[PDB]
């Protein structure tokens, strides 16, 4: 507040739905183009999830929807 999108990481006990909401709000607050925000989400969202969730999300493979990610965790 203001936090860089680079610093948003899922806590060890943080539910994935809470982390995605925190990530979304932080990125909304960032002063950047839609292109930069898209690149940031593609690069950081799964990468900055906690190791337990990251194993689950990566197993879904590329192109998984947010709905599918929510129903996996």
């Amino acid at each position, epitope marked *: 507040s*203001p936090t*860089s*999108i*680079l*610093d948003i*990481r899922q806590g060890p006990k943080e539910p994935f739905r809470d982390y995605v909401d925190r990530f979304y709000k932080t990125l909304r607050a*960032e*002063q*950047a*183009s839609q*292109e*930069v925000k898209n*690149w*940031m989400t593609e*690069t*950081l969202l799964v*990468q*900055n999830a906690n190791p337990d969730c990251k194993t689950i999300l990566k197993a879904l493979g590329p192109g998984a929807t947010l709905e599918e990610m929510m129903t996996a965790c």
Partner: nanobody
Amino acid sequence: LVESGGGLVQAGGSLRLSCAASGSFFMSNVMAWYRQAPGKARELIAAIRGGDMSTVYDDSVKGRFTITRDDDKNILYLQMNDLKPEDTAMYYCKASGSSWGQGTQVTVSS
């Protein structure tokens, strides 16, 4: 963390910013340059990711600025070409979990 390369230049001029940092900074997959002009919120203008070396730029810096990372020296760069008066601001480098630095001032006349 050492940020430098800023200074006073005329419109159409060039500068190369350097972000010399620790190994911990360079463990971050994503690194970015932020621009902050007086009385304005900071803007995410350029970013790079480790491995494939993919980059992204804000529309206001396309075809003028280039972000590069030297993993052998742990230095993040921002090559700024065809500088415009609107580029006048404090420039900051950022990585995941990194402490903000002092920034470096870029001032463009005309």
